[PDB]
Symmetry: C4
Subunit: 219 residues, 4 copies
Amino acid sequence: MYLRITNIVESSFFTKFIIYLIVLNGITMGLETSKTFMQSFGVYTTLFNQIVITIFTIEIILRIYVHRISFFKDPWSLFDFFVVAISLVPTSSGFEILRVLRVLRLFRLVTAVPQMRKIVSALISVIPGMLSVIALMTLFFYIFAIMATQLFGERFPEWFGTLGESFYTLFQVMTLDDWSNGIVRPLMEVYPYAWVFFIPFIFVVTFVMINLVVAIIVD
Amino acid sequence: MYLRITNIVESSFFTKFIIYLIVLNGITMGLETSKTFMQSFGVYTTLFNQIVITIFTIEIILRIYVHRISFFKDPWSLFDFFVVAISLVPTSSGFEILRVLRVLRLFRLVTAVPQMRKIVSALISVIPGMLSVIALMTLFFYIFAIMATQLFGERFPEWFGTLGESFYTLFQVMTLDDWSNGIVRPLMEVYPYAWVFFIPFIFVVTFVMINLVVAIIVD
Amino acid sequence: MYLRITNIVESSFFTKFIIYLIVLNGITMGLETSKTFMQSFGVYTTLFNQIVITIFTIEIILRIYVHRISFFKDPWSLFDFFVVAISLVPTSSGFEILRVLRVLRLFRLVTAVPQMRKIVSALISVIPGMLSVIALMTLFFYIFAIMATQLFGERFPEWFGTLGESFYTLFQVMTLDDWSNGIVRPLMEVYPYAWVFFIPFIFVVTFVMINLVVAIIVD
Amino acid sequence: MYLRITNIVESSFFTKFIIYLIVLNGITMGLETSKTFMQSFGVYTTLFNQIVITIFTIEIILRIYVHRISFFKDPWSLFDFFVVAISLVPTSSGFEILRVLRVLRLFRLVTAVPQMRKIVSALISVIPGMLSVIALMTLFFYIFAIMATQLFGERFPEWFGTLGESFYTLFQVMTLDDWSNGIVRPLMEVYPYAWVFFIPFIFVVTFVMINLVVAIIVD
Ligand SMILES: COc1ccc(CCN(C)CCC[C@](C#N)(c2ccccc2Br)C(C)C)cc1OC
Ligand SMILES: [Ca+2]
Ligand SMILES: [Ca+2]
Ligand SMILES: [Ca+2]
């Protein structure tokens, strides 16, 4: 009974059938943001959403039947599973973010449509080499998050009152977002010398990113 | 009678002549932005323009006999066509904006100088390779924009009330422009976990971008 | 019994563990950020803090007896030395800014983990190459800061009132932080030609940067 | 006479002495930043200045004899000539800006130090191969600056009343500086489609720039 379906899955028609559905649901999903649309035609779309979700679930099972254990070591396939499984919990008691997460299902376009997968693959592939600098930056940020909560969090709770807040604010400055008129000049009206931790924090932070990118190019 | 024209149109005087006209027009088009200039010299310029549009109009018709079906298979020539074209379409009819669109005709200086066109060509030529990254990034933006409108549009209709607006703000965060104190910090005052939405978004979008340059460089 | 003591601190059991105390101190220090936590658990960590500082002190002393003159020509241990020493400076010198500098010893995880060291050292190696770039820039900065102070200082004391202040604003404009709406537009209301100063400045600082990166790549 | 004068100017003593003098006049002008310093030592620094311009006028004179007409074919010296010459034009009456342009003489540290000469010349060296893109981009800016003024200049004069104003504003958007909340969102409150102008625009300027940098790198 294996042989019957295995021929169905590998067909030009199975894949193209799934892909045409995704691009369709993605067009559907666009229209789902207009509440006005959701009046005049709202009923069609909860249905369409239930149908596609059913089809995909069936479709994942056959592929596991066909691929067995070789399915759960293909990351692209694992993602489609995790992206499909996610899309199935009822949106009531569970966080209502999952009603919003189900648009991730459009990322199935990447997994099933070639060219798209490689680019993601090329990109993911620079990540393991970098994990160390990522560990560095995170330890670095953390040492500085601690310093900032203690140095400025008393008088400036919105920016530095909590360790998590300190991370964020600190993150903004690295992204160079309104950082001087916005955060430190305020800081200097009380702390004339905050530039001693924000001007160098900025140098380091800039220095590493630039050197990281450079290190990508050489490699 | 068909045989006579080709030797005129192809001459190095022809090409030298048209480029001169573009530069004079471009000087005059600068002048048209000045009000003072207009009372004082308005009427010379409004008429100079239609003489130039005809001369260009004459050149294109002529160029089509010599180059035949292959005229319209030339991308450089097609631009030439539509740009003088748009300067021919009447004012009240269609839009009113295209009257002002006319300034685009200074871009003929690019079409007609071999040195400019090759840079442009070289520039255009990285793109067929980018069409994967454009496609990929457009798909990614689309997906987060849908999530953002539904997450954030009822309480912030100005910013996310709508898909377009959702796109717009997301392009903006991507350019890192006042992204935090100006969009996300406010957001965070009603929706605290918005940093989970935008800080990841920021990483992804700036990462994809950086790596795009490396493969441009290497290739 | 020399080599026996030497046997001890060079062991893999000792270091990973004291690395683990770093990881441990790193955790409690995050915890010290909470006023809630500090209230009902303050003595656990006021306690946890004293043991660790002591342990680190014996290690530094010991590693010296093992290495002697060699200890003090190792850049990573001098760092190690100085950041424990700082913690051996008491609570107050009026400047209780030092009690905050204590959390600097968490950079010891960098000194203590060879894979960390590899990354930092790679990063440093970039710098000497740029010492030439650094002097030219600091000079241009020095002069223009002077022109700025004299030019804008009387009417705009916050921004340019002072050599140091013009330095800060100039650094800000160089990071391209709200440079237009935030500084130059206001200035031109009093001094309409200020664009003749700052756009050239921007031009140079952007330019040199770009060029800075290119040098890094080749090096 | 000729050879006797010619042999002191070319010496390691002459130029070291001038460099030594330049560093003081640079240190001296920073002190002139402090009106505090000026009411307490201003008489010391007002003539230290005065004899330095004397010495430099003389130094310049000697160097002219040694190199004759070939002096005015040297970029660094012609620079030295005018940059000192400027400080000799009388402050009073005709114009008072000329007093501040006098500070440019501190740029001679570059002129007189060969490492500095090496750096600058290297920098200038990348410019000739960039000019063509300067031409295209400047031509693009010139086209859109015309457009922004006719399109947005009526209702928004501060930003677009004048070409220079559209240039400056486009340059800002180019510098990507507070462009959405600061510029285009307001435009959009009257002209909802203003983004069809500005969003493509940002794509272009960012694209050309990267590829400009990239073109630099590979060679
Ligand atoms: C995420 O961390 C970052 C932290 C910091 C920066 C530098 C940001 N930059 C100052 C903003 C625009 C500046 C730029 C130049 N200058 C530019 C970009 C696009 C168009 C024109 C220009 Br003039 C360019 C080199 C990124 C980038 C980061 O990611 C890319
Ligand atoms: Ca920025
Ligand atoms: Ca900014
Ligand atoms: Ca800003």
